[PDB]
Amino acid sequence: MTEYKLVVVGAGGVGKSALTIQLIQNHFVDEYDPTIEDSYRKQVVIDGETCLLDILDTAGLEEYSAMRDQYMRTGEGFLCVFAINNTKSFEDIHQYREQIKRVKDSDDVPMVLVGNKCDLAARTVESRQAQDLARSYGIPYIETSAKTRQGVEDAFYTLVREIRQH
Numbered sequence: 001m002t003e004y005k006l007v008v009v010g011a012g013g014v015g016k017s018a019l020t021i022q023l024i025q026n027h028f029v030d031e032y033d034p035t036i037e038d039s040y041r042k043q044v045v046i047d048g049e050t051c052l053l054d055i056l057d058t059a060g061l062e063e064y065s066a067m068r069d070q071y072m073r074t075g076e077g078f079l080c081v082f083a084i085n086n087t088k089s090f091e092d093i094h095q096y097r098e099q100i101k102r103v104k105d106s107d108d109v110p111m112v113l114v115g116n117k118c119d120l121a122a123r124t125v126e127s128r129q130a131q132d133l134a135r136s137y138g139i140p141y142i143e144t145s146a147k148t149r150q151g152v153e154d155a156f157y158t159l160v161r162e163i164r165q166h
């Protein structure tokens with residue numbers, strides 16, 4: 001059936017792996033093992049359509065960000081993740097936006113801005129601030145929690161729906 005190539009990007013430790021693993025394997029990864037480049041595949045029915053999701057979990061740490069550009073090349077949609085308790089991760093979203101533009105050589109790439117770790121109380125990035133950023137890119141802003149699963153499916157499914165509008 002239809003295959004959707006999704007790519008998760010964002011600063012180190014924002015929760016890219018936890019989000020992906022919660023979506024695909026249904027459990028929360030409590031420990032922090034820096035990622036180099038991992039891929040996941042799973043058949044799911046979205047809006048009545050049986051589709052194959054190929055999700056690339058990329059490195060947020062520069063030290064593990066080797067040929068990251070090459071892996072992302074085939075990506076059809078991207079989740080740009082920051083953590084609501086990490087202001088710097090939010091401020092650096094533009095870096096990932098720029099990288100995506102380069103790898104895809106396009107200004108119109110399906111995307112979703114994700115504010116992860118919404119279960120944490122030390123929030124320094126208010127929803128409104130993220131909504132303004134997303135609005136400027138013309139993309140949806142969705143908050144998630146890889147820990148409680150809140151907004152997790154919504155984030156990935158919305159990305160599929162954005163690819164469909166593409």
Ligand SMILES: Nc1nc2c(ncn2[C@@H]2O[C@H](COP(=O)(O)OP(=O)(O)NP(=O)(O)O)[C@@H](O)[C@H]2O)c(=O)[nH]1
Pocket residue numbers: 010011012013014015016017018019029030031032033034035036058059060061116117118119120144145146147148
């Ligand atoms: N409370 C809470 N902790 C989270 C959440 N998502 C991730 N974490 C925690 O944050 C740490 C880093 O998460 P991880 O998914 O490894 O981040 P990453 O973005 O994949 N890191 P890297 O880019 O180096 O590969 C882990 O200890 C993980 O449990 C969340 O929604 N809530």
Ligand SMILES: [Ca+2]
Pocket residue numbers: 031032033
């Ligand atoms: Ca470990």
Ligand SMILES: [Mg+2]
Pocket residue numbers: 016017018033034035057058059060
């Ligand atoms: Mg990771």
Ligand SMILES: [Mg+2]
Pocket residue numbers: 124
């Ligand atoms: Mg403030």
